[PDB]
Structure formats: structure tokens, C-alpha cells
Amino acid sequence: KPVIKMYQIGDKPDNLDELLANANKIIEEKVGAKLDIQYLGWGDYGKKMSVITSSGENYDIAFADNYIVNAQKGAYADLTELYKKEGKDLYKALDPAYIKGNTVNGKIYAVPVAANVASSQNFAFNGTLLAKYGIDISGVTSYETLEPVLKQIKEKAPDVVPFAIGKVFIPSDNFDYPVANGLPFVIDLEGDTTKVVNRYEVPRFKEHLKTLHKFYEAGYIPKDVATSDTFDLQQDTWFVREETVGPADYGNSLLSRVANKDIQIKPITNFIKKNQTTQVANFVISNNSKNKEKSMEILNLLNTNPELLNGLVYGPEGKNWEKIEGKENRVRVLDGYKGNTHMGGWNTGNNWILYINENVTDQQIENSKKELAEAKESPALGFIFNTDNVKSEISAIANTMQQFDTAINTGTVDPDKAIPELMEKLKSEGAYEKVLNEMQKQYDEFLKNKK
């Protein structure tokens, strides 16, 4: 009977009507409701979602935007009770880090999509060029050790961009940024895990920037890196890129499929479960929703029913995909899947009930299982930085930071010159040390509780 309205980020599938009509046969029979999914786009999602949540505007489910803050404001139904019955199977199937990462004032407001609960940063190499020039990447574990292979591609293929990075680039390390900004503050997971530090004062981080500046000067990264936001994976204009890979991607499988060619990966950071990885794809139930129970029931089903979820994420069976006879849980993806004819895997539901593409090797499935099992939590997982005392000081730092940020992070300027200038500018007003100490203070209390 009741129509449950869901808001989703991005652009609709071409066949959304058909997808939902197929899905709703299962939903209607299982729960006695029907799902309506409306897509609000990519660009202005926050903006659109903020209007919806501020007014008494009717919706039941939404892909959450600015989740942590809105959860504190009571914008979302408390799922604590919802999870013991209606969301029982979903709660049981969720990795503990998903609950921890999404708890706000002692309660859970989210149905997170179980996927890349942990992720690593990787160099992704263009296998076509790797094979053409016989370039050996077995020594590559860091920015520093990337240098010899960049020199070789510069040698051998001078029109190719060696390291394809853009204006958004910053070196990755084993750091946790618990609060999504804006700000240079991290927990160094290899340092003192009790201390909030500035990334630009971490010795090996400064070394990454020195390396990147050398890479800049040698022509390994675009001259116009600071203004560029361009390198389609399928094209051969690039040699190496930085890519986030998690267990739901099955190693190089996802990248190699999208690139439609061999993509080889070399990790540079450890697989970590943190705020960023546990909060990336959350569904929320509206605080002012007439069917909280049934909305939760649909979410339970979306995340536990293989036929339902696979129909949505892979699209029409027989046209977009086929089951492999004799191989349970395995599918052959067809030409139709190349279209905009299905929903996204990352933001629809539990990836662990998704059928596994035939091109994923046995070793990749095993490697994925192990990485997921062996992934450690950050000590800052579930840390909420309350900005109420420091909202003005935060904007002041952001304002200063945003002037020098891009030049430094891309390695456009010499960090030996630019970091001391930026630090001097920040330390010359009062905002910087206030936000740092406030963050440290809250992180102290966070670790004291728990313990």
C-alpha cells in the first residue's frame, strides 16, 4: 500500500521506471509497500537535500548529505529501536565499524551501504604502456620509489603524462582526517595516535611534498596541475594515477573493467576503517516520516535480498547480465550494462550480496576477503569534532589555507619555502592554535570515554 519516497544522489537510470516496477514486485509482496526513487543530481545534492530537511517537506528515505551535523539536529529518525526488529538482518550483517563510525550522541541514524568499510590509496598503472615498454613496477611502494618508472615513461613516451594528477591532489599517508574539511589536522596512525598534528609538520609528509616538487620540476606532473581537473582511464594519455581501492572493488578488477584494459595497482597506504570510509554512503529515515517502520523494512530488504538488489544494481536480467550455471553468486555482464541502465553499487545496498563478475579471479575474491578481515580501525573512528566554540576560527584558517593550499599540495611550489610561509601566516593570528587545542581537547575526551 504506502508509497515510500527515496531521494538518491546522481542522475537517474534511463530505465528507472522499469527497474522500480521489477523491484516493486518483490517489495510489495515482502513488505506491503512500494518504493519510489527520485534522483536529485550530482552537483547540487547538498543544496537540494538541505531545503528538504529544513522544511517539513515529506520524504521517507534519503541518501544523506552532511550526515554528522544533521544527525545532531534530530533531522533523522533514531534507528536504535528500528534495528532490533525491522532492520534486524541488516544490523546483524553490518561490520561493527559501520555502527561506530555512524553513531552520534550514543545513537545510530544511518543505514550505511556495506562496501569499502576500509580502503587503501594506490598507484594505478596503464598496463598497455607497462607492456609496450616493459616497465617494471615491482619496486613501487611510495611516491619516492615511483621516481624511476616516471623517468622511464618520460624517456620512452614523451607525449604521455607520467603521473596524472589534478588541482585536488594531496599526498596520501596513513593519516586520519576525522572531520571532512578544509583543515590540515590529522591523527598520524604511525605517530602518536593520541595527538592531533598538522600534516605539513609531519616529517615524511613534508618529504612527500619535496618529492612532488621534484616531480613537478622534472615534468612528471602537468605544469598546470594547480588549475587542471582532467584523465579518462580508457585513453593512453597517462602512465600512473592515484586511485582509492577497497575490498568491494576486488583489487584491480573494478578499475580494469572501467578502463576496459589492464590496470595494475600498487598500494601506498594501509587499509583503514575510519570516519571517511564508514560514512561515505548512508541512508537516513526522515524525522517527519509517516512510515518509519516500512521505510526501514525496505532498507532491510534492499540490503538482504539478492534478487532485489542485483536487479537494481545490475539492471534487467537477460539483457544486462546472465547467471553462470554451476557457479553460484557469479554473473556474466553483457553489452546492456555499459549503458545508464542500472543503479550504482556503492550507494544502493549491501555489496556482499551482489553477484560477482566472472572476470574477477579466484585469488581476487580471496585477497578481498582477507583485506576486509585484516583491516584495522582508526582510533579516531566515531570521533565527532564539535565546531560550536570555533566556527569563526575555522573559517579564518580555511580562508588563509585556501590561498596557499593548491600550490603546495600539487608540488607546484617548493615546500621548503612555502610551508614556513604558510605556518608563519597561520601562527600570526589566534585562530590556528585555538582550533588545534580545541580539537586536541575533544580528542582527549573522546579517548578517555570508550576507555
Residue numbers in the entry: 40 to 269, 271 to 491
Quote the study that presented this structure, word for word.
We also identify a solute binding protein (SBP; NgtS) from an ABC transporter (ABCNG) that binds soluble N-glycans and, through X-ray crystallography, reveal the molecular basis of its interaction with these branched glycans.
We tackled this hypothesis through a functional and structural analysis of SP_0092, the putative cell-surface attached SBP of the ABC transporter, which we refer to as NgtS (N-glycan transport SBP). NgtS in its unbound form formed crystals in the space group P21 that were sufficiently robust to withstand soaking in high concentrations of sodium iodide to generate a halide derivative. Each α/β domain consists of a central β-sheet of three β-strands flanked by α-helices, with the N-terminal domain possessing an additional solvent-exposed two-stranded β-sheet. As with other SBPs, the ligand-binding site was found at the interface of the two domains comprising NgtS and ligand recognition involves a transition from the open, unbound form to a ligand-stabilized closed form. Despite these two complexes being obtained with different ligands and in different spacegroups, the overall conformations of NgtS were very similar (rmsd of 1.0 Å over 427 matched Cα positions); both complexes were in a “closed” conformation relative to the “open” conformation obtained in the absence of ligand.
